A paper describes a structure:
Four monomers were present in the asymmetric unit, three (chains A, B and C) forming the biological trimer and the other (chain D) forming a trimer with two crystallographically equivalent monomers in the crystal (space group I213 has a three-fold crystallographic symmetry axis). Amino acids from the N-terminal T7 and 6xHis tags could not be modelled in the structure due to lack of density, as was also the case for residues 234–236 of each of the chains and residue Lys345 of chains A, B and C. Using NCS-restraints, the structures of both the seleno-methionine variant and native protein could be refined to low R-values at 1.6 and 1.7 Å resolution, respectively, with good geometry and Ramachandran statistics. When the structures of the fibre head monomer of the different crystal forms are superimposed, no significant differences in main chain conformations were observed. When trimers are superimposed, the r.m.s.d. is less than 0.5 Å, suggesting the orientation of the monomers in the trimer is also fixed.
Numbering used by the authors:
A (entry chain C): 239 to 344
B (entry chain A): 237 to 344
C (entry chain B): 240 to 344
Write the structure that this text describes.
Amino acid sequence: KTSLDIAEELQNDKGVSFAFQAREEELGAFTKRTLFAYSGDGLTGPFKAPASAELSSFLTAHPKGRWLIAFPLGTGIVSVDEGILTLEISRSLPEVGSGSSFYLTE
Amino acid sequence: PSKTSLDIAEELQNDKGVSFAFQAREEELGAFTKRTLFAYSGDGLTGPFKAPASAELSSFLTAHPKGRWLIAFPLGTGIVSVDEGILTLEISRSLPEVGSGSSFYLTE
Amino acid sequence: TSLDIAEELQNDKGVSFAFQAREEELGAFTKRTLFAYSGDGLTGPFKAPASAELSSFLTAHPKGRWLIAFPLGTGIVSVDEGILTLEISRSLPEVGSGSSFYLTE
């Protein structure tokens, strides 16, 4: 059922930190991959931080090559490039809070 | 042991090639049961999405206390309903990309 | 494996919410998620007595409250002396469902 369930804390160069969880679930013919993201901090601009090789692999796997994600106060896109995660945001966020983004594939 | 008593998924496509994956899950939490609809599309939606659903998905969708599913996507809001095995998703605004979202209810 | 608290709260005006509070372990990480559902509308804040167990769970958030997105607006859930308060960003003709979590190690 659940074949991957990993979590890690990432921090950018100015001390903003995020917890990310990557979950993979098998549902008969379908596989579901969910990215969960949490930060108590605000973001003025994009969040860029080194990510584990395993989280990077998971992020790369998305059919869109990136992860559109809703937070309470705005929208983000999560991507990875050479082990650096980037979360770009639609507007500055005084607090990020929590959100998730998934896809299903068969 | 698992709390998940139902976990089904299916892919729907409309006459215009837009496609959605839907997952229906039921989780038993003692006195309460949660039923969740998960929806995903990489496509945009100009207007409502209509496609045939399985008998199982249709039954799950019908069971909601409101008779339909208010659902948040990143760029707008939808209502998912079913009528004679045709699923309809109506959207609040046109969406350049739908992305993912979920809608649940809890019942005792 | 996950641990859940679930209950239905009602205010003095008949608005009802269901809450599920889930705790999950992911190695060095703990994830706590609050799930909230109401089919009702809300003009202003929802206030109702909550169980000691839900109150305890709610208090554990590092921010001391739960920023939560519903389809039509944002809320903050807090607890004070076993009374749950959900404050909302704008009036909601229908609350719907939403969830709020944190993960910490």
